[PDB]
Design an enzyme around this catalytic site. Structure first.
Site, PDB file in Angstrom:
ATOM      1  CG  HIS A  68       4.337  67.174  62.173  1.00 29.39           C
ATOM      2  ND1 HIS A  68       5.167  68.152  62.668  1.00 29.39           N
ATOM      3  CD2 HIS A  68       4.909  65.987  62.512  1.00 29.39           C
ATOM      4  CE1 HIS A  68       6.190  67.587  63.294  1.00 29.39           C
ATOM      5  NE2 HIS A  68       6.046  66.270  63.245  1.00 29.39           N
TER       6      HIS A  68
ATOM      7  CE1 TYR B  22       3.711  71.594  66.356  1.00 29.21           C
ATOM      8  CE2 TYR B  22       6.102  71.237  66.271  1.00 29.21           C
ATOM      9  CZ  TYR B  22       4.895  71.232  65.677  1.00 29.21           C
ATOM     10  OH  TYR B  22       4.865  70.812  64.387  1.00 29.21           O
TER      11      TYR B  22
ATOM     12  CD  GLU C 247       3.179  71.043  61.678  1.00 30.87           C
ATOM     13  OE1 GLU C 247       2.820  71.216  62.895  1.00 30.87           O
ATOM     14  OE2 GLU C 247       4.342  70.531  61.338  1.00 30.87           O
TER      15      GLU C 247
ATOM     16  CB  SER D 200      -0.368  56.024  47.950  1.00 31.27           C
ATOM     17  OG  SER D 200       0.918  56.147  48.533  1.00 31.27           O
TER      18      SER D 200
ATOM     19  N   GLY E 143       5.289  49.290  41.516  1.00 33.33           N
ATOM     20  CA  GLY E 143       4.518  48.755  40.401  1.00 33.33           C
ATOM     21  C   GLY E 143       3.634  49.734  39.638  1.00 33.33           C
ATOM     22  CG  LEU E 144       1.311  48.877  35.214  1.00 35.25           C
ATOM     23  CD1 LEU E 144       0.021  49.557  34.722  1.00 35.25           C
ATOM     24  CD2 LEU E 144       2.525  49.516  34.592  1.00 35.25           C
ATOM     25  CB  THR E 145      -1.710  50.581  40.575  1.00 34.45           C
ATOM     26  OG1 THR E 145      -1.714  49.668  41.685  1.00 34.45           O
ATOM     27  CG2 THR E 145      -2.359  49.962  39.322  1.00 34.45           C
TER      28      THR E 145
ATOM     29  CG  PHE F 131       3.925  56.519  45.011  1.00 36.45           C
ATOM     30  CD1 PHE F 131       4.343  56.544  43.653  1.00 36.45           C
ATOM     31  CD2 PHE F 131       2.613  56.892  45.330  1.00 36.45           C
ATOM     32  CE1 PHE F 131       3.463  56.984  42.641  1.00 36.45           C
ATOM     33  CE2 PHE F 131       1.718  57.321  44.324  1.00 36.45           C
ATOM     34  CZ  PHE F 131       2.152  57.385  42.989  1.00 36.45           C
TER      35      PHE F 131
HETATM   36  C1  LIG Z   1       3.403  58.308  52.925  1.00 36.05           C
HETATM   37  C2  LIG Z   1       3.021  56.841  53.117  1.00 36.05           C
HETATM   38  C3  LIG Z   1       2.204  56.219  52.138  1.00 36.05           C
HETATM   39  C4  LIG Z   1       1.837  54.879  52.331  1.00 36.05           C
HETATM   40  N1  LIG Z   1       0.977  54.275  51.359  1.00 36.05           N
HETATM   41  C5  LIG Z   1       0.637  52.959  51.477  1.00 36.05           C
HETATM   42  C6  LIG Z   1      -0.181  52.375  50.524  1.00 36.05           C
HETATM   43  O1  LIG Z   1      -0.643  52.984  49.553  1.00 36.05           O
HETATM   44  N2  LIG Z   1      -0.539  51.072  50.751  1.00 36.05           N
HETATM   45  C7  LIG Z   1      -0.073  50.325  51.809  1.00 36.05           C
HETATM   46  O2  LIG Z   1      -0.439  49.142  51.967  1.00 36.05           O
HETATM   47  N3  LIG Z   1       0.740  50.908  52.731  1.00 36.05           N
HETATM   48  C8  LIG Z   1       1.097  52.222  52.585  1.00 36.05           C
HETATM   49  N4  LIG Z   1       1.934  52.771  53.548  1.00 36.05           N
HETATM   50  C9  LIG Z   1       2.338  51.866  54.716  1.00 36.05           C
HETATM   51  C10 LIG Z   1       1.184  52.066  55.751  1.00 36.05           C
HETATM   52  O3  LIG Z   1       1.173  53.417  56.176  1.00 36.05           O
HETATM   53  C11 LIG Z   1       1.338  51.133  56.956  1.00 36.05           C
HETATM   54  O4  LIG Z   1       2.623  51.377  57.457  1.00 36.05           O
HETATM   55  C12 LIG Z   1       1.119  49.641  56.633  1.00 36.05           C
HETATM   56  O5  LIG Z   1      -0.238  49.523  56.230  1.00 36.05           O
HETATM   57  C13 LIG Z   1       1.482  48.723  57.818  1.00 36.05           C
HETATM   58  O6  LIG Z   1       0.783  49.164  59.009  1.00 36.05           O
HETATM   59  P1  LIG Z   1       0.196  48.249  60.061  1.00 36.05           P
HETATM   60  O7  LIG Z   1      -0.559  49.091  61.111  1.00 36.05           O
HETATM   61  O8  LIG Z   1      -0.600  47.161  59.429  1.00 36.05           O
HETATM   62  O9  LIG Z   1       1.533  47.606  60.630  1.00 36.05           O
HETATM   63  P2  LIG Z   1       2.346  47.913  62.052  1.00 36.05           P
HETATM   64  O10 LIG Z   1       1.612  47.219  63.188  1.00 36.05           O
HETATM   65  O11 LIG Z   1       2.588  49.366  62.325  1.00 36.05           O
HETATM   66  O12 LIG Z   1       3.746  47.072  61.848  1.00 36.05           O
HETATM   67  C14 LIG Z   1       4.608  47.457  60.778  1.00 36.05           C
HETATM   68  C15 LIG Z   1       5.433  46.258  60.352  1.00 36.05           C
HETATM   69  O13 LIG Z   1       6.084  45.689  61.462  1.00 36.05           O
HETATM   70  C16 LIG Z   1       5.903  44.283  61.467  1.00 36.05           C
HETATM   71  N5  LIG Z   1       6.172  43.839  62.849  1.00 36.05           N
HETATM   72  C17 LIG Z   1       5.339  43.259  63.776  1.00 36.05           C
HETATM   73  N6  LIG Z   1       6.039  43.035  64.914  1.00 36.05           N
HETATM   74  C18 LIG Z   1       7.307  43.485  64.733  1.00 36.05           C
HETATM   75  C19 LIG Z   1       8.438  43.492  65.558  1.00 36.05           C
HETATM   76  N7  LIG Z   1       8.521  42.494  66.439  1.00 36.05           N
HETATM   77  N8  LIG Z   1       9.633  44.049  65.086  1.00 36.05           N
HETATM   78  C20 LIG Z   1       9.737  44.556  63.798  1.00 36.05           C
HETATM   79  N9  LIG Z   1       8.602  44.518  62.999  1.00 36.05           N
HETATM   80  C21 LIG Z   1       7.410  43.995  63.444  1.00 36.05           C
HETATM   81  C22 LIG Z   1       4.514  44.085  60.882  1.00 36.05           C
HETATM   82  O14 LIG Z   1       4.228  42.829  60.297  1.00 36.05           O
HETATM   83  C23 LIG Z   1       4.538  45.137  59.820  1.00 36.05           C
HETATM   84  O15 LIG Z   1       5.153  44.554  58.699  1.00 36.05           O
HETATM   85  C24 LIG Z   1       2.323  54.111  53.424  1.00 36.05           C
HETATM   86  C25 LIG Z   1       3.140  54.750  54.384  1.00 36.05           C
HETATM   87  C26 LIG Z   1       3.469  56.115  54.237  1.00 36.05           C
HETATM   88  C27 LIG Z   1       4.373  56.762  55.259  1.00 36.05           C
HETATM   89  C1  HEM Z   2      10.261  70.985  66.050  1.00 35.42           C
HETATM   90  C2  HEM Z   2       9.577  69.897  66.487  1.00 35.42           C
HETATM   91  C3  HEM Z   2       9.402  68.609  65.621  1.00 35.42           C
HETATM   92  C4  HEM Z   2      10.216  68.070  64.668  1.00 35.42           C
HETATM   93  C5  HEM Z   2      11.569  68.529  64.094  1.00 35.42           C
HETATM   94  C6  HEM Z   2       9.639  66.855  64.165  1.00 35.42           C
HETATM   95  C7  HEM Z   2      10.168  66.080  63.176  1.00 35.42           C
HETATM   96  C8  HEM Z   2       9.603  64.969  62.630  1.00 35.42           C
HETATM   97  C9  HEM Z   2      10.154  64.123  61.592  1.00 35.42           C
HETATM   98  C10 HEM Z   2      11.503  64.370  60.917  1.00 35.42           C
HETATM   99  C11 HEM Z   2       9.260  63.148  61.354  1.00 35.42           C
HETATM  100  C12 HEM Z   2       9.420  62.007  60.363  1.00 35.42           C
HETATM  101  C13 HEM Z   2       8.741  62.550  59.154  1.00 35.42           C
HETATM  102  C14 HEM Z   2       8.624  61.483  58.036  1.00 35.42           C
HETATM  103  O1  HEM Z   2       8.755  60.250  58.298  1.00 35.42           O
HETATM  104  O2  HEM Z   2       8.375  61.863  56.886  1.00 35.42           O
HETATM  105  C15 HEM Z   2       8.154  63.313  62.245  1.00 35.42           C
HETATM  106  C16 HEM Z   2       7.007  62.538  62.349  1.00 35.42           C
HETATM  107  C17 HEM Z   2       6.031  62.541  63.336  1.00 35.42           C
HETATM  108  N1  HEM Z   2       5.790  63.545  64.268  1.00 35.42           N
HETATM  109 FE1  HEM Z   2       7.135  65.124  64.500  1.00 35.42          FE
HETATM  110  N2  HEM Z   2       8.456  66.671  64.807  1.00 35.42           N
HETATM  111  C18 HEM Z   2       8.272  67.698  65.730  1.00 35.42           C
HETATM  112  C19 HEM Z   2       7.145  67.874  66.511  1.00 35.42           C
HETATM  113  C20 HEM Z   2       6.062  67.052  66.690  1.00 35.42           C
HETATM  114  C21 HEM Z   2       4.913  67.243  67.574  1.00 35.42           C
HETATM  115  C22 HEM Z   2       4.674  68.443  68.538  1.00 35.42           C
HETATM  116  C23 HEM Z   2       4.123  66.161  67.476  1.00 35.42           C
HETATM  117  C24 HEM Z   2       2.861  65.983  68.293  1.00 35.42           C
HETATM  118  C25 HEM Z   2       2.459  64.793  68.730  1.00 35.42           C
HETATM  119  C26 HEM Z   2       4.720  65.224  66.536  1.00 35.42           C
HETATM  120  C27 HEM Z   2       4.244  64.003  66.099  1.00 35.42           C
HETATM  121  C28 HEM Z   2       4.734  63.238  65.083  1.00 35.42           C
HETATM  122  C29 HEM Z   2       4.220  61.929  64.714  1.00 35.42           C
HETATM  123  C30 HEM Z   2       3.002  61.188  65.395  1.00 35.42           C
HETATM  124  C31 HEM Z   2       5.059  61.461  63.537  1.00 35.42           C
HETATM  125  C32 HEM Z   2       4.965  60.106  62.739  1.00 35.42           C
HETATM  126  C33 HEM Z   2       5.860  59.021  63.350  1.00 35.42           C
HETATM  127  C34 HEM Z   2       5.193  58.136  64.416  1.00 35.42           C
HETATM  128  O3  HEM Z   2       3.929  58.026  64.450  1.00 35.42           O
HETATM  129  O4  HEM Z   2       5.866  57.501  65.287  1.00 35.42           O
HETATM  130  N3  HEM Z   2       5.855  65.844  66.079  1.00 35.42           N
HETATM  131  N4  HEM Z   2       8.400  64.439  62.932  1.00 35.42           N
HETATM  132 CL1  LIG Z   3      15.587  70.646  67.037  1.00 37.30          CL
HETATM  133  C1  LIG Z   3      14.960  68.994  67.115  1.00 37.30           C
HETATM  134  C2  LIG Z   3      13.630  68.714  66.952  1.00 37.30           C
HETATM  135  C3  LIG Z   3      13.223  67.385  67.057  1.00 37.30           C
HETATM  136  C4  LIG Z   3      14.168  66.363  67.270  1.00 37.30           C
HETATM  137  C5  LIG Z   3      13.758  64.916  67.386  1.00 37.30           C
HETATM  138  O1  LIG Z   3      12.371  64.837  67.620  1.00 37.30           O
HETATM  139  C6  LIG Z   3      12.012  63.537  68.011  1.00 37.30           C
HETATM  140  C7  LIG Z   3      10.568  63.506  68.565  1.00 37.30           C
HETATM  141  N1  LIG Z   3       9.497  63.415  67.470  1.00 37.30           N
HETATM  142  C8  LIG Z   3       8.939  62.256  66.944  1.00 37.30           C
HETATM  143  C9  LIG Z   3       8.067  62.652  65.986  1.00 37.30           C
HETATM  144  N2  LIG Z   3       8.053  64.062  65.886  1.00 37.30           N
HETATM  145  C10 LIG Z   3       8.956  64.465  66.817  1.00 37.30           C
HETATM  146  C11 LIG Z   3      12.148  62.679  66.780  1.00 37.30           C
HETATM  147  C12 LIG Z   3      12.035  63.216  65.527  1.00 37.30           C
HETATM  148  C13 LIG Z   3      12.153  62.375  64.438  1.00 37.30           C
HETATM  149  C14 LIG Z   3      12.391  61.006  64.606  1.00 37.30           C
HETATM  150 CL2  LIG Z   3      12.518  59.898  63.194  1.00 37.30          CL
HETATM  151  C15 LIG Z   3      12.505  60.453  65.871  1.00 37.30           C
HETATM  152  C16 LIG Z   3      12.376  61.329  66.932  1.00 37.30           C
HETATM  153 CL3  LIG Z   3      12.499  60.685  68.554  1.00 37.30          CL
HETATM  154  C17 LIG Z   3      15.499  66.660  67.438  1.00 37.30           C
HETATM  155 CL4  LIG Z   3      16.708  65.360  67.804  1.00 37.30          CL
HETATM  156  C18 LIG Z   3      15.897  67.993  67.363  1.00 37.30           C
END
Ligand SMILES: Cc1cc2nc3c(=O)[nH]c(=O)nc-3n(C[C@H](O)[C@H](O)[C@H](O)COP(=O)(O)OP(=O)(O)OC[C@H]3O[C@@H](n4cnc5c(N)ncnc54)[C@H](O)[C@@H]3O)c2cc1C
Ligand code: HEM
Ligand SMILES: Clc1ccc(CO[C@@H](Cn2ccnc2)c2ccc(Cl)cc2Cl)c(Cl)c1
EC number: 1.14.12.17
Length: 403
Positions: A85, A95, A137, A209, A277-279, A396
């Site tokens: 977040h 929130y 946060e 990463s 991998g390695l990196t 990673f």
């Molecule tokens: C903590 C963390 C660290 C990360 N570190 C790296 C990193 O070091 N390097 C790296 O390259 N990435 C990393 N990622 C992944 C990165 O964040 C992105 O998710 C990645 O670059 C793909 O994003 P995008 O916007 O290009 O794809 P998106 O548009 O979000 O799509 C995601 C995937 O869905 C596919 N897709 C398209 N249409 C559909 C559909 N019809 N249904 C299902 N799938 C579909 C796409 O081809 C793609 O493979 C990391 C993610 C996290 C959470």
């Molecule tokens: C108590 C309230 C909330 C809970 C429990 C919650 C929980 C979570 C969890 C479990 C994840 C996945 C984390 C991961 O993949 O490592 C996530 C991601 C995320 N959260 Fe929340 N969240 C809350 C509130 C909020 C709020 C207020 C926002 C504001 C917009 C928000 C925005 C996001 C976004 C943008 C992601 C990444 C996933 C995506 O982009 O679709 N969350 N949260």
């Molecule tokens: Cl007490 C409580 C707080 C939040 C939630 C679910 O919260 C939504 C909404 N959301 C999305 C990102 N951050 C929050 C949510 C969170 C994680 C993912 Cl993997 C999908 C979704 Cl739909 C619940 Cl069931 C209970």
């Protein structure tokens, strides 16, 4: 704060939300984006298949239910979400928007099943977790901002170099547009990139990463180009590859993430890798093996010999460091791989098979690789009695299938 009765409701109903997770998520986004369309700029708008979204949510919900009576385990899972977040720039005033639409989606999907007691209990859980998360946060933001070279929110960087590392992975070196210092990070931490996606008309944000070690001046990421041909291409990875060149600017978040070694601890390190991998794994293994020595076990869950760069770097380290214990699993051994000289055990990492070897007093566990691999290994270790606070895992680097 939740009473025992209300915790009991949450516990008894978590499987219910889980079972209906797909419908709940769909209704939640529909309702939320209809009131607040500006949030499409913070949420991921690319489509992910159904099962994946259902599972993610089920998992969060089960993680909460399981640890609702265990403050120390609960905080361990929350800090992971606080880090994400904070990377995304989540704000306290968002929130109330998410809670309203999430509750309304729970009611809508659950229909009759969504009793008054259940909605109120989950509204309470929401208010309690939102409180915890906001405070965590805010700490993160404040700690980043007080660091030399740290900041809050988006900071503009310039691509200083752009180098292919494979036909599909490209490394980007970034320096801040203001020319100032950049705050340190630990191996396993990530930045977020926020960029306008012309095809969507929206900002999208993705985590990358942070490679190598910090140097006070620049950061490097490796970005895998996603999709193309049979796969519809990913938004941001293709945009970085094809339109973001040397001299162009992007917005970065400060480094976040709780997946990293505590350089101040003296306790054992169990690294469990599911195909990375390695990196960038090398930077983290380097941190693990810095003096003063710590007991380090590396569990390497690979394919087979076909790629063996990480197996070889690891075998060499295991010859210099008497405190490194290496285990290798090959899940699909090549005809030519023999159990005993090319790997230790057939299949995916299986911690019961090496219990005595990894179940070390006060250890921390670091899992990386494919997402289902990290989850499998998380749950295996929980089943051996390891506390939630000692298990760490994250995406990673650019290739969870490098080996
Ligand atoms: C903590 C963390 C660290 C990360 N570190 C790296 C990193 O070091 N390097 C790296 O390259 N990435 C990393 N990622 C992944 C990165 O964040 C992105 O998710 C990645 O670059 C793909 O994003 P995008 O916007 O290009 O794809 P998106 O548009 O979000 O799509 C995601 C995937 O869905 C596919 N897709 C398209 N249409 C559909 C559909 N019809 N249904 C299902 N799938 C579909 C796409 O081809 C793609 O493979 C990391 C993610 C996290 C959470
Ligand atoms: C108590 C309230 C909330 C809970 C429990 C919650 C929980 C979570 C969890 C479990 C994840 C996945 C984390 C991961 O993949 O490592 C996530 C991601 C995320 N959260 Fe929340 N969240 C809350 C509130 C909020 C709020 C207020 C926002 C504001 C917009 C928000 C925005 C996001 C976004 C943008 C992601 C990444 C996933 C995506 O982009 O679709 N969350 N949260
Ligand atoms: Cl007490 C409580 C707080 C939040 C939630 C679910 O919260 C939504 C909404 N959301 C999305 C990102 N951050 C929050 C949510 C969170 C994680 C993912 Cl993997 C999908 C979704 Cl739909 C619940 Cl069931 C209970």
């Amino acid at each position: 704060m939740l009473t025992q009765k209300t915790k009991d409701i949450v516990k008894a109903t978590a499987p219910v939300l889980a079972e209906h997770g797909y419908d709940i998520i769909k209704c939640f986004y529909q309702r939320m984006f209809e009131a607040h369309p500006e949030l499409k700029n913070v949420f991921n708008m690319a489509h992910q298949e159904q099962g994946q979204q259902q599972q993610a949510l089920a998992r969060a919900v089960y993680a909460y239910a399981e640890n609702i009576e265990d403050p120390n385990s609960l905080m361990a899972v929350l800090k992971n979400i606080a880090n994400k977040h904070a990377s995304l720039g989540v704000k306290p005033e968002q929130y109330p928007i998410v809670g309203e639409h999430l509750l309304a989606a729970i009611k809508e999907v659950l229909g009759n099943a969504a009793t008054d007691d259940i909605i109120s209990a989950w509204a309470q859980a929401y208010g309690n977790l939102a409180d915890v998360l906001m405070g965590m946060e805010s700490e993160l933001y404040e700690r980043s901002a007080e660091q030399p070279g740290g900041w809050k929110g988006w900071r503009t960087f310039v691509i200083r170099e752009k180098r292919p590392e494979s036909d599909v992975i490209t490394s980007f070196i970034l320096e801040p547009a203001d020319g100032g210092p950049v705050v340190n990070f630990e191996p396993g931490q990530y930045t977020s990139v926020a960029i306008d996606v012309p095809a969507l008309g929206l900002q999208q944000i993705r985590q990358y990463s942070l490679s190598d070690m910090p140097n006070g001046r620049s950061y490097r990421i490796s970005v895998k180009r996603e999709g193309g041909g049979p796969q519809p291409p990913g938004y941001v990875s293709n945009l970085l590859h094809d339109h973001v060149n040397v001299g162009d600017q992007v917005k970065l978040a400060a480094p976040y993430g709780s997946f990293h070694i505590d350089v101040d601890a003296k306790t054992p390190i169990v690294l469990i890798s599911g195909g990375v991998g390695l990196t960038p794994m090398v930077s983290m293994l380097k941190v693990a093996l810095q003096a003063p020595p710590r007991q380090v076990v590396f569990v390497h869950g690979a394919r087979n010999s076909a790629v063996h760069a990480m197996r070889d770097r690891l075998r060499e380290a295991a010859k210099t460091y008497e405190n490194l214990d290496l285990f290798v699993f090959y899940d699909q051994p090549l005809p030519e791989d023999v159990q005993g000289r090319d790997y230790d055990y057939p299949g995916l990492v299986d911690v019961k098979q090496i219990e005595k070897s990894i179940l070390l007093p006060d250890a921390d566990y670091y899992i990386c690789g494919p997402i289902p691999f990290m989850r499998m290994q998380h749950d295996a270790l929980k089943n051996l009695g390891i506390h939630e606070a000692r298990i760490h895992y994250e995406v990673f680097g650019p290739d969870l299938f490098a080996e």
